[PDB]
């Protein structure tokens, strides 16, 4: 069967030395952040999901990557903390990493930063920013093939300035900032598969969020299994 | 007669040490890429030529450089591979290098990247990208005086990011990206000589492609001679 | 045209550094042995040829190598010296090296040492032995793919002991000693192409010698051209 | 055919390392002095030739060297510059170097310095003097076997003092100064072949100059070929 080791091998192109280091950092990072990784049961973040914060596209991008969508406007920082929000991505990642094609072709994430407030950045402490850079680089068995930021306000760049120093040059090359006129540039990266709200043709974000919410709730037994 | 050595001397301004190194890399590169350079007979790429992928201007630029035109939209990656396409440039280069004035004044190439798809970049592997940088720098007796990219889509820069690390600073200075509004900037570099499709006045790309296709087919005996 | 340089490139697999060194040794060796290489006109060794000392097979071996045959019994050391005999091989080599397929696939030589006397070895001085090793290794643009010694007497090994210290390990691997029962082992290396005297089926050594003698005499104008 | 390389090999006794260095300096020197070597067409110096400045003996010296004669009195420094005069020697050298026997036996030059004025030395700048020493030593594929100065005035030694520091010891050994009573000493070096004006028996300098002038004008097509 697809062993737990196999996802780490594929993430590092069957370089046993590199895959081993990634495995070490995976356990290390999970140990230094139990407030995110100790309990992966969707119980603590179901409110976030039903608020419409997160969803995953059905179809893959032209290179076979899984496409993830985050909407920061649907995150209420008064209700959920940065750790809660982080846990959502962690939960999704632990699920999609089971897909062999995702293991081979990595993922791409889209962040709709419309509605980013000063109530969001306060949650993003230096410790949090470094943990963000960790999972983006060499602490989780997922190839980050691209990060796409749209509708990012001027005040956000201060937040990104906290993450960038801990980023490898490879990942920095893969982070895109589109601004408010994102639609044309975003459609080139993701043809046919985007939802209606982002220039897409068929499905809406509400449907996509609901579907992924169901899948997470459905996978609640597996998410408990990998909890320590 | 214009010896085979003479083209290497002129390419390095009669610096015998440098011209010798270029000769060494010329044979080395040809040995490490037989899937491109072993057989230069136009047989394997005649379909590409008649598709309208490549053509050479009759008139030289204001500095005497030969001007080459490539249209990526006329490359069907399902039919022809990157090696096939590479072979086209190799064939053209082996022909125009016979011109003494081309030896002295180098070449300039225009790439119409309109229609660049994710089906094109998949062909461009790290090994291919490094071979591209090789012939652009110090592995073929042709001075690359300028590379002009027009209509380049957003997704192309990821491909260029694979080539750039292997490029010398001199060549990087000579690579131009014009975007969609290229016509004004392109006409300044190439007055009077451009085809109709790119702001020109007289000839069309279809004529230019056909003429160069005829010349290549006509030179099929010479191209077989230099095959190993 | 097939330049004089090209034979040196092919001899060293288009390694310009190595091919250059071979060219240097080619001129050096020719300069330190004018009593062999100054005059390559068949005048001085026509008697050797008509005595039946040397011949070249029409057909190539299974790998495309030219096959050369020497019969030491037809060398009268009282009439011709070691330098005269050496000149024969030099003349043949300068002729067969013009064949592109010989340049690519190298040569193989068969020495019938039947009749090797103490009047032959006296001619083989330490200086001569070292010159033999020179052309076998890195002083002539011919790949020596194999040397086959048959009917070698016990007293010959003393002579070979003079050559061996100056031989590279590569060439030593390619020197074969078959003894008196050579026919079976020799036929495995050279199927279908051997003459009647050595297990062959069709042609005789006398015919083969005469044919190569004619060709050398016919090429007398070219052999004068390369004389210094 | 006698390749362009072959003249450099013979000039350095088939020492490939040394012949290669001479080739490098040949292109270097030609690049640092285009005001002498860019255009070798006899157009710019035909007046010098018809003035009777230069001629070449028909017969070779006892060692087979080509013998060149220069008469400084027939150089009008008001009309022709040092570069023009230098070009004459360059033109002659590029012609006589085609002779295989000249390649093997080198050249000898005779300078009649009778009439050397202070209007001649002003043309001989430090830069010019060093260029003179360059072609005399290791920058042109011609063995300088001897330089003979006759009728040299006292004021000339200041000019020679500018050249001597850049001369190798070998060439310095081969430079002879005869003075006004040169005839006896000059006849020992050049028996039977000298013109009437220098103790000769048959031909006059006017005939010799005219003959070489015709040959240069006749070779005007070749001299254009080697121009860059
Ligand atoms: C394995 C994996 C994880 C675990 C992951 C992400 C990706 C691509 C992964 O492959 C992306 C998002 C992230 C880092 C969660 C981020 C948590 C914070 C609270 C998000 C809100 C504010 C961010 C400042 C917005 C920008 C984020 C991008 C710069 C990644 O969690
Ligand atoms: C001697 C010589 C060769 C041999 C040559 C070129 C030039 C200017 C030369 O002087 C330019 C084109 C190239 C490198 C062939 C490229 C092959 C690939 C398949 C082209 C399609 C995709 C490219 C990623 C498009 C961008 C190319 C530019 C950045 C050069 O082949
Ligand atoms: C380029 C080239 C030359 C020039 C050449 C040979 C080969 C294979 C070449 O590729 C083989 C023969 C040789 C060395 C001539 C040998 C001269 C002596 C006189 C031969 C008689 C006695 C030899 C002791 C017999 C054994 C020779 C083998 C050990 C090669 O000349
Ligand atoms: C290949 C070659 C060249 C190119 C050459 C010469 C020789 C022997 C060559 O082999 C001799 C003459 C020279 C150097 C041209 C000299 C130019 C000047 C203007 C001559 C007039 C004044 C000289 C100060 C007179 C003395 C010259 C000797 C000391 C050589 O050009
Ligand atoms: Cl972008
Ligand atoms: Cl530009
Ligand atoms: Cl054997
Ligand atoms: Cl003297």
Author numbering:
A (entry chain A), B (entry chain A), C (entry chain A), D (entry chain A): 48 to 275
Cite, word for word, the article reporting this structure.
Inspection of the density map of the α-TTPS model revealed well defined density for α-Tol indicating that the protomers in the particle are bound to the ligand. The trimeric interface is characterised by hydrophobic packing and further stabilised by salt bridges.
Retention of α-Tol in animals requires α-tocopherol transfer protein (α-TTP) in the liver, a cytosolic transporter of 32 kDa weight. α-TTP belongs to the Sec-14 like family, a protein group involved in secretion and lipid transfer. α-TTP recognises and selectively extracts α-Tol from the endosomal fraction of the hepatocytes allowing for its transfer into the inner leaflet of the plasma membrane and eventually across the plasma membrane into the blood-stream. Here we show that, upon binding to α-Tol, α-TTP is formed acquiring tendency to aggregation into high molecular weight oligomers. X-ray diffraction reveals a spheroidal nanoparticle formed by 24 α-TTP protomers of ≈17 nm diameter. We verify that such particles are efficiently and selectively transported through a model endothelium tissue from human umbilical vein, with a 28-fold increased flux with respect to paracellular flux.
